[PDB]
Swiss-Prot record, chains A, B:
Residues 1-306 are cytoplasmic. 3CL-PRO exists as monomer and homodimer. Only the homodimer shows catalytic activity. Interacts with host FBXO22; this interaction promotes the proteasomal degradation of nsp5. It comes from the Viruses. It is found in: Host cytoplasm; Host Golgi apparatus; Host nucleus. This is 3C-like proteinase nsp5. The lineage of its organism: Viruses, Riboviria, Orthornavirae, Pisuviricota, Pisoniviricetes. Changing P132H: In strain: Omicron/BA.1, Omicron/BA.2, Omicron/BA.2.12.1, Omicron/BA.2.75, Omicron/BA.4, Omicron/BA.5, Omicron/BQ.1.1, Omicron/XBB.1.5, Omicron/EG.5.1. The active site is at H41 (for 3cl-pro activity), C145 (nucleophile).
Length: 306, 306
């Protein structure tokens, strides 16, 4: 038992991280087979990143303007192209550590692990969710651009996120691995801001099931509610609506605990209307929304990856 | 910016995890050079683990009673011995993935990363602290015995923890890598229980500094206090005493924020006496004590590992 915000083992991704330098900008790249992926704003300078034209900036570059460092070895760039907001740097060596991988785009509400990197060297790993407003509440400093987010499904790394920028509220925005931003953010230095967020209702319910599984039951009650009457309460507390597909996804957890999904919604209603009254759930005094039903089954049942 | 509970990249440790089977018990082992380390209770059976004599149990075992699985390869055990509560299984192959490593024993209050494993396959990574009562609040199921806790200092893995058991409150107990338990726990199935815990004061203060660095300042005040008058409040709220060495360790963070350590203690006093009044700090409605001053400097400055 116990419940922790748990990331995937990062080894398979560590072997893909490299350092990309262009001009006086250094950031991280992702080396798979003979391609290095990195944020296109690497080709910009301080006065470029105000309002850049990336097609213009890139045509003025040469293969030799890109320095790729794989640990303490020199990768020769033999080609370069832009794909949306990422650069693809063709190099003369295939990464021998290339795992089986996919490029997938995730939904707000889903989670992934982040391997934060600086100068191509991995620094730490942690678990994030894609917020409903398409930002992520990450932990990122100067130099961290190009760190990636991923999930692991058996032996295959599904890359879903590459870091590009920090917004004024301290949250982070980036792209999928085909270079398409999550949310309405652009890789240029405007006054852009996050925009209003919501709480991920199905995840909160999943985490309440994790708490029951781990022995926290004080918030349970004999009450029930209808889906429609629950969603009225959700809207007022800026939770997002619960759908029948969410109820279905919570079925296994419902079955395992014997607590009907709509019964747990009634528990959530009461928590939203009364608060917790000085008590905690799974070591938190807040309702946690960054665990999916999958994450909970994973950790409260024990699946591995090879 | 941002602040996350961040673990070390796990790759260097993933390459050391193996599966150890003896009888009908399977758990995890740690393979360094030509030795596999694992909890000694692997040699016990259901009726053995009540009150075992491990010297008796081990003399009745042979090298061939230990099955060591390194992925999908067979390691031949060529020797076995007991060192306190761990077994050392001499195998006929040195682990080619052996990192530079040390065996260190940590202090309550210090943190480490855990690579939870099942059947020798790594499942997830997360960050824990050694509680003042020598337990850890981990996330561990059947089969997870022998997963290890570690820190990384540049390229060298300092192993500090190997998992042995879950206590009735759902918290976890284990040993250092020389087999000596943390705390007053034994690898036998008694009625043993955690014992009373305290909050790690210096860590809370460090985390308050992380919050200031990240823009949370609402809990700051013009008040100050003396170390003695702070420690009077700490005792009443079951925080542990703050020492002058703690004040010194918090110096860099103090300097960086311009908030004197004793000023931040006065802020902590007020938080303990008034609570937070519906506000949050770094996304928490509780005072967090599982980040050390080092962890905070690490994440709010950006050190890597190679
Ligand atoms: C990458 N290592 C770094 N981010 C950038 O360099 C991007 C890049 C340039 C500015 N930028 C930013 O993240 C923002 N800028 C913005 O315009 C904003 F707010 F997103 F709209 C700054 C935080 C630097 C002002 C362009 C082309 C958008 C990076 C990544 N994560 C965190 C972080 C923290 C501090 C400095 C740089 C950071
Ligand atoms: C290892 N994979 C497993 N732990 C054990 O097998 C140890 C081992 C036997 C019993 N044990 C336990 O962790 C406790 N037993 C206790 O006696 C206690 F509470 F610690 F005092 C049980 C939780 C199984 C009752 C001995 C020799 C102490 C393990 C490790 N982590 C979690 C976990 C959860 C469920 C089952 C087994 C678990």
């Amino acid at each position: 038992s116990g419940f922790r915000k748990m990331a995937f083992p990062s080894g398979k991704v560590e072997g893909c991280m490299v350092q990309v330098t262009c001009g006086t900008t250094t950031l991280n790249g992702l080396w798979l087979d003979d391609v290095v992926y990195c944020p296109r704003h690497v080709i910009c300078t301080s006065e470029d990143m105000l309002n850049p034209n990336y097609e213009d900036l890139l045509i003025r570059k040469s293969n030799h303007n890109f320095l790729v460092q794989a640990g303490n070895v020199q990768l020769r760039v033999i080609g370069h192209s832009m794909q949306n907001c990422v650069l693809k740097l063709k190099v003369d060596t295939a990464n021998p550590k290339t795992p089986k991988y996919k490029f997938v785009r995730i939904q707000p509400g889903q989670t992934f692990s982040v391997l934060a990197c600086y100068n191509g060297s991995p620094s730490g790993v942690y678990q994030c969710a894609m917020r409903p407003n398409f930002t992520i509440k990450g932990s990122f400093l100067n130099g961290s651009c190009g760190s990636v987010g991923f999930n692991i499904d058996y032996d295959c790394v599904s890359f879903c996120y590459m870091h590009h920028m920090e917004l004024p509220t301290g949250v982070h925005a980036g792209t999928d691995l085909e270079g398409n931003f999550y949310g309405p953010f652009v890789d240029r230095q405007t006054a852009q801001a996050a925009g209003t967020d919501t709480t991920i209702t199905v995840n909160v319910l999943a985490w309440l099931y994790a708490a029951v599984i781990n022995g926290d039951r004080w918030f349970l009650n004999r009450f029930t509610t209808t889906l429609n009457d629950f969603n009225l309460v959700a809207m007022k507390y800026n939770y997002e609506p619960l759908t029948q597909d969410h109820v279905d996804i919570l079925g296994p957890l419902s079955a395992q605990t014997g607590i009907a999904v709509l019964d747990m919604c009634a528990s959530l209603k009461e928590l939203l209307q009364n608060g917790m009254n000085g008590r905690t759930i799974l070591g938190s005094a807040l309702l946690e929304d960054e665990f999916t039903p999958f994450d909970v089954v994973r950790q409260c049942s024990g699946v591995t990856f090879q």
